[PDB]
Structure formats: C-alpha cells, structure tokens
Amino acid sequence: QRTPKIQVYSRHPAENGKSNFLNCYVSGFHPSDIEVDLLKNGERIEKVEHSDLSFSKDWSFYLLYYTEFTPTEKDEYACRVNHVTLSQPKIVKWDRDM
C-alpha cells in the first residue's frame, strides 16, 4: 500500500486568455486502481484524457491526466485524487508558479 504523489501544473507558461493544457501527474502508487478528476471552480471537467499505465524501477505506478484549458485571473483549478490508501479524496490546488 503506497500513497500517490500528486503534482498539478500547466504544460506551457500560464498566460491569461491563452490556450494551454492542465496536467495532474500521479505517481509512486500501488495498487493500480486510482480515480483522478480535474476541477474548474470545484466542478468536474468531463473531457479529461490520460496516458497508458506504466511503472517505475520500484514497481510503483504513474499516470498523466490532462485537459485543454484557457487560464483567467479569477478561475481556480485543482486535481481531486482518490485511492485505497486514502480515507478521503485528496485535493491539490493549481498554483501558476509551481
């Protein structure tokens, strides 16, 4: 039972009014079954795709979840992750500088 490491970020430098890609990279987990959703102001984004399942040297899994978006000054984004190792869904807020 290994808990997932989560990183929420943009593909390109975040600029207001320009099309970009919102990423949620989950890694260092075991077992494989995991639930990841990207949120826009608290609501689930329907159009989210993901990479094919793979693993690291220590056998732990990694996946990239992404969606196309256009960042603005007021809109807040986050990544909601649930796994068997977690008693409650872990939400990580998106910071443009990280």
Binding site: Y25, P31, S32, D33, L53, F55, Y66, D97
Partner: protein, 274 residues
C-alpha cells in the same frame, strides 16, 4: 550517450467477474511507441509514435499475437501465485513484468533485464550475467528451480544481446529526427518575496528531452542543501519534461546564489544568477 528499449506488462485480477485487466507498453528511452489495453475495442497492439507506423502487417500481427499470449500466461500466473501464497479467491492481486536492453556510448550491448513482481514486491529477476536468477522468497525459488531446469535464461539471453539490440538501433534510426534529437532545457529564474527580509528564487528547467537532469543550488561557489526545495521530474504532455529547484535567501543577497543545470543537450553546464 546511452539508449534503451523496454516493455512493461501489468495484470490485475478481477475476482468479481471475468478475465484480468491487462496493460502492456513499450518505450524507446523516454518515448512510448506501442500499447495494448485488454479493455480497448481493437484487441491489437496499437502504435503510439509516428515512426513505428511504417512497420508492415507482418509486424503488427506478430506483436498482437505475442501480447495476447502474454495476457493469458499472466492470468495463469495470478492463479498459480494465489495457490503458492495460500491467498483468498475473493481478493484482487497484481502481476507485473518488465524486460529490455541498453546500448552503451560505443553503440553496442551494455546490459539486459527481465524481472517480475507480485503485489508490488520483487518476485524473480534475471541477474546481470543473464545466466542466473534472483529469487526473493520460497514461492519464487520454486519458479527458479523450474526455469533453470528448462534452460529459460539461455533463450532470454539470445534476445537481450541480439534481437533486442538490433531492433532498438533500427527504431533509433527510423525515428532519428526526434529520438536522436537532444532538447536542452529552456531555463529562467523567478523571484518571490516571502517577507521584507527573505525571498524565494526559483530555478526553472522547461521543455527538455531526455528526462535525466540535475539541478543544483550554490552559495558563493559551494553547494547548499539547507532551505531548498526540489520537485520531481514531471512530463509536460507533449513528449518533453519539466523540473524546478528553489531556495530561500535573505533579501538583497540574491547575487551570491547560482543555479547549475546539467543535461545531455547542454555541451557544458549552465549557470543562472539573479
């Protein structure tokens, strides 16, 4: 510069209903090129890189047959390991398999691998000599005795030192425009005031390939471990990778601090200063 070709297989049992979930992926370095998903409608080995699409019908039928065969041996493996470990039939378990070869700076064979895991822990692994096995427990020792008697290692050795290396070199050539192109990190430094007395300097490394990179912070020419933060290397989603290293410094003393970047795309290390 060294190169590698890898294949990763994951089989997760479905005790409630049906056959196990099977996902297989192939890499050349940090570029995924093939896939197989047991839940997909095609039920074929599918291309994930533009340079592999040029391979003919014989290749795709051969790869589909081999991965479908693997899906069935791992289904059997899940059943065999449940028996060895005296586990319940009601629980869901995982069998993972990985194999591949590396080529050195001289472009010839460097090393080969072929290893397995059960529920995330080491089970059995082929050693570096490609002749012997490393068994973790007594269930794995049973597998080792059987595989050494059947001369399995010899069959894997022929592939790892021969066919694996030959096909990796072929891919590296057919996809050279991208595969042998080194993308050096696009670097810059940001400044964030934490207070009137302290500040955060963040050293960025963007849009690079391969994933292998080193970001180090220095104060007056010497390394600094204290008051630093470094996130792990993450994929941008377009085939490239990202990373950053930060440091908390006293305001007005930013000049003493330097960020050093090491990557295969940089002929000499990069030095950034605010």
């Amino acid at each position: 510069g060294s190169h590698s070709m890898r294949y990763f297989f994951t089989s997760v049992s479905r005790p409630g209903r049906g056959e196990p979930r099977f996902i297989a992926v192939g890499y050349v370095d940090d570029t995924q090129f093939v896939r197989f998903d047991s839940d997909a409608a095609s039920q074929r080995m599918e291309p994930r890189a533009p340079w592999i699409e040029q391979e003919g019908p014989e290749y795709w039928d051969g790869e589909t047959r081999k991965v479908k065969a693997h899906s069935q041996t791992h289904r059997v493996d899940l059943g065999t390991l449940r028996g060895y470990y005296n586990q319940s039939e009601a629980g869901s378990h995982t069998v993972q398999r990985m194999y591949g070869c590396d080529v050195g700076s001289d472009w010839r064979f460097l090393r080969g691998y072929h290893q397995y895991a059960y529920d995330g822990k080491d089970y059995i692994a082929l050693k570096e000599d490609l002749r012997s096995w490393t068994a973790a427990d007594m269930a794995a020792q049973t597998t080792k005795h059987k595989w050494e008697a059947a001369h399995v290692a010899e069959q894997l050795r022929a592939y790892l030192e021969g066919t694996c290396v030959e096909w990796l070199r072929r891919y590296l050539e057919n996809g050279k425009e991208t595969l042998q192109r080194t993308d050096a990190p696009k670097t810059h430094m940001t400044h964030h005031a934490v207070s009137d007395h302290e500040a955060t300097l963040r050293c960025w490394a963007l849009s690079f390939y391969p994933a292998e990179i080193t970001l180090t912070w220095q104060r007056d020419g010497e390394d600094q471990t204290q008051d630093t933060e470094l996130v792990e290397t993450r994929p941008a989603g377009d085939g490239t990778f990202q990373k950053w290293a930060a440091v908390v410094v006293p305001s007005g003393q930013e000049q003493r601090y330097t960020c050093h970047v090491q990557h295969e795309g940089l002929p000499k290390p990069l030095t950034l200063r605010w």
